Each structure stands twice: as structure tokens, then as C-alpha cells.
Design a protein around this ligand. Structure first.
Ligand SMILES: CC(=O)N[C@H]1[C@@H](O[C@H]2[C@@H](O)[C@@H](CO)O[C@H](O)[C@@H]2O[C@@H]2O[C@@H](C)[C@@H](O)[C@@H](O)[C@@H]2O)O[C@H](CO)[C@H](O)[C@@H]1O
Length: 162
């Protein structure tokens, strides 16, 4: 495993994700912050997209890319330190995937399904009902939002791959 960072580039090219599995990793931030986005500059319901945030417990996280959508999933009141992926693909208008940020580093795993499709994977240990626990292990397949659309990186990040 090769782990490099902190990278400060503002764009990861889609073409650099198609060859191998890539972890995008973050030291735990001190407050809620937008981490990355895949999608056009302004919301376009015809295209798949996703936007990843870190959310600090007790704060409200509101999507930037989805700020104009008519859907309550565009905000999240964090009840744990967490990662939040606002996303849309296919006939899903908007969902938010939340995983708890259990350690001093966290992030997402990108697995290429083909040159134009990626599986985004997120995991974390969460509680509910005050004493039930769950290892959330989630993934979703995304086609590239459209040709030419890369990943916007808004904070420094680490990359891990083989
Ligand atoms: C929401 C989503 O997942 N968008 C993808 C998708 O978009 C396609 C698809 O939804 C089909 C219906 O099955 O309809 C169009 O073909 C649509 O194309 C997208 O929207 C049109 C209006 C154009 O802007 C076109 O350029 C755009 O691709 O699949 C495509 C790949 O074919 C992309 O992956 C979208 O993000």
C-alpha cells in the first residue's frame, strides 16, 4: 500500500481512477467541511453526481451542489462525527449516505467497474437506539457524470493505492 499526502491539487482526473482501487483519505477535520464533488458546476438533474462532506457532531451540513434542489435530503443534522455523501444517480433524485468517523483518519474507497463507472464505498461503526451498534458497509455504482467531468477537491487529502 502506497499512501501519499497531503495533496493540495484541486482536481483529481477521472482517468487516474480507472486503473486501480483508490482510497481518498482525510485527517479528521476540526469542523464540518466539504471534501470533494463529482458533477457539473451547477446542479443538473439529468446527470449523476455526488458531494462528500465531513460533518462534526452537533452541526448542520447543507449541500452546495444540491442547494437548489427541492428535497429534504440536501441537509443533514449530524449526531456523530461523520462522513456525508449527498448523491444522485439513475432514478434516485437525492439520497444522503452517512457513516460515523470512528478514527483519526477516514474517507472513501473508489473501485473502478469500467472506464466510465466507479463503485464508491463507505463504512463506519454507528449506534442507534442508544445501545444497538452496526458496522455500516455501503456502496453505490456511479457512471461518470458526463464526459470530461473530473473530481473537485476542496481540502487537502491523502491517496492510498496498490
Ligand atoms: C441521472 C444519471 O444517472 N445520469 C447519467 C445517465 O444519463 C442518461 C440517462 O439518464 C438516460 C435515461 O436512461 O437519459 C439520458 O441519456 C441521460 O443522458 C444525460 O442527460 C442528457 C439530457 C444529456 O445531458 C446527456 O449528455 C447526459 O449524459 O447516463 C449518462 C451516460 O450515458 C451519464 O452517466 C449521466 O450522468
Amino acid at each position: 500500500m502506497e499512501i501519499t499526502g497531503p495533496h493540495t491539487n484541486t482536481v483529481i482526473e477521472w482517468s487516474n481512477l480507472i486503473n486501480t482501487n483508490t482510497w481518498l483519505l482525510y485527517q479528521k477535520p476540526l469542523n464540518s467541511v466539504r471534501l470533494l464533488k463529482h458533477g457539473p458546476d451547477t446542479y443538473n438533474s439529468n446527470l449523476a453526481a455526488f458531494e462528500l462532506w465531513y460533518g462534526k457532531s452537533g452541526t448542520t451540513i447543507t449541500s452546495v451542489y444540491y442547494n437548489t434542489i427541492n428535497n429534504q435530503n440536501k441537509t443533514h443534522d449530524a449526531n456523530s462525527d461523520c462522513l456525508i455523501l449527498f448523491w444522485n444517480e439513475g432514478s434516485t433524485q437525492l439520497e444522503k449516505q452517512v457513516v460515523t468517523f470512528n478514527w483519526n483518519v477516514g474517507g472513501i474507497l473508489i473501485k473502478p467497474i469500467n472506464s466510465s463507472r466507479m463503485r464508491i464505498c463507505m463504512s463506519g461503526m454507528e449506534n442507534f437506539n442508544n445501545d444497538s451498534f452496526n458496522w455500516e458497509n455501503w456502496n453505490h455504482e456511479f457512471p461518470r457524470s458526463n464526459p470530461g467531468i473530473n473530481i473537485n477537491m476542496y481540502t487537502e487529502y491523502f491517496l492510498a493505492s496498490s
